[PDB]
Amino acid sequence: MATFPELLRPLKLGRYTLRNRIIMAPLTRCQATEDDHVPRTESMLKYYEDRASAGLIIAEATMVQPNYTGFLTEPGIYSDAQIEEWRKIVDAVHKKGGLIFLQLIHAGRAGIPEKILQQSKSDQDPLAGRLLAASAIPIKDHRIPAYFAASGEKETYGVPEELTDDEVRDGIIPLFVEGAKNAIFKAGFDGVEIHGANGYLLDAFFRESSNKRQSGPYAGTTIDTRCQLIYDVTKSVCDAVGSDRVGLRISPLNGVHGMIDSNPEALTKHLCKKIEPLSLAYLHYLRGDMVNQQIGDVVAWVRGSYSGVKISNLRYDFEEADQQIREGKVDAVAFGAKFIANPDLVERAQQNWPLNEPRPETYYTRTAVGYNDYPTYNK
Ligand SMILES: Cc1cc2nc3c(=O)[nH]c(=O)nc-3n(C[C@H](O)[C@H](O)[C@H](O)COP(=O)(O)O)c2cc1C
């Protein structure tokens, strides 16, 4: 463990202490049932337990609103059936001595029209059968990926309804809260991660391009009001399960779905100071753009405006993560692609062993291929 000593240091995170700072980023793999969104335990339990040596595992984006799917077959955490399977998966990770937080998501305008708009639309279930977002602005010049599309081929995103302030406060927020309770109190997760990134609902209220709301506490007119939904959701979840079991993820420069803010630096620093009072377990962020267009020193922005645990992500390797931790710029680094391809990523870091190359074209097969078929070193 001489090559990356800083990366292998333990870390106090919330009410826990990580064995190392090699974190497994949340990765949607679509291994849940399509209709009920129940985790397919047979494959998911193995997948997660095989990666349980990670300092912390952040489980893939999981639905908080019934049937509001964005990835067609992702997991949910709203039903008893989902809770039970997650419970078994979590227990498996815990038997290996690992830690695991569940990422909570609401796809917002990235919801799949052909599925959501097919659901029933009753008065007792006011949010059902509807596309919901901050503003009625559809994702443009970007179609639904074949691996997420209901038909299996690229489909068009739809124009979402503009959530009223009451629907946000009494409809959306409570779902995140209940999802957190289900995850922690019933399934046994060590914590939850609020998905405030990658163009989904919370991020959609966060950045200018998707939030043009004219009035209300979530107006798109000012940085503070755009930060409010992320804060309110996070705060209410903290009220329910304890801030030391709550993390938050953001991506100020991620251009997926055409997301963009004209002043990412000011926005990020403003959010950091706004959540500073919550004493969260951690703040998780993408330091760059998945589409390689937007640039900005997110690591520096966060380092100078947030005193809590900072988890950075995006195109990191052991050496760089180790160095940034050494310099105190970040506390830990979350790896996505490398964890998909290396169940024993941590062990490889300890021995400075080479890594399996990822097969980026097999990330969403929904079968064992490209999911549970990556070998550990020399096996
Ligand atoms: C197949 C796949 C699924 C992903 N699923 C999620 C997700 O559910 N939630 C999320 O916040 N990010 C998700 N991401 C983004 C990753 O968490 C991570 O930020 C990204 O892979 C960049 O990090 P890397 O360079 O270490 O791979 C996903 C990425 C991939 C490639």
182 lines ligand 1 (CB under 6 A): no
- Find out whether 267 and 261 touch, Cβ atoms under 8 Å: yes
Task: Report residue 356 as tokens.
Answer: 């399996």
Task: Report residue 27 as tokens.
Answer: 């990765």
Which of 47, 68, 157, 200 is catalytic? The answer is 200
Binding-site residues, in ranges, read 26, 28, 61, 103, 249, 313, 315, 336-337
Which of 22, 28, 30, 60 gets mutated to test ligand 1 (max ligand atoms within 8 A of its CB)?
28
Q: Is 155 helix (H, G, I), strand (E, B) or coil?
A: strand
The domains found in the chain, sorted by start residue, are 1-379 (3.20.20.70)
Determine the distance separating the centroid of ligand 1 and the alpha carbon of 25, expressed in angstroms.
6
- Find out whether 63 and 37 touch, Cβ atoms under 8 Å: yes
Binding-site residues for FMN, in ranges, read 26, 28, 61, 103, 249, 313, 315, 336-337
Strand partners, 13: 16
Query: Rounded to whole angstroms, how far apart are CA atoms 349 and 248?
Result: 26
313 lines ligand 1 (CB under 6 A): yes
315 lines ligand 1 (CB under 6 A): yes
Nearest C-alpha to atom 6 of ligand 1 is from which residue? 27
Angle at 202 between CA 198 and CA 204, to 5 degrees: 65
Is 200 annotated as catalytic? yes
- Find out whether 40 and 83 touch, Cβ atoms under 8 Å: no
Q: Is 63 helix (H, G, I), strand (E, B) or coil?
A: strand
Determine the distance separating the centroid of ligand 1 and the alpha carbon of 336, expressed in angstroms.
5
Write down the experimental method used for this entry. Answer: X-ray
Task: Ligand 1, residue 363: give the atom nearest the CA.
Answer: 1
Strand partners, 101: 58, 191
Sequence-ordered strand ranges (E) for the chain: 11-13, 16-18, 22-24, 56-63, 100-105, 132-133, 161-162, 191-196, 246-250, 282-286, 310-313, 332-335
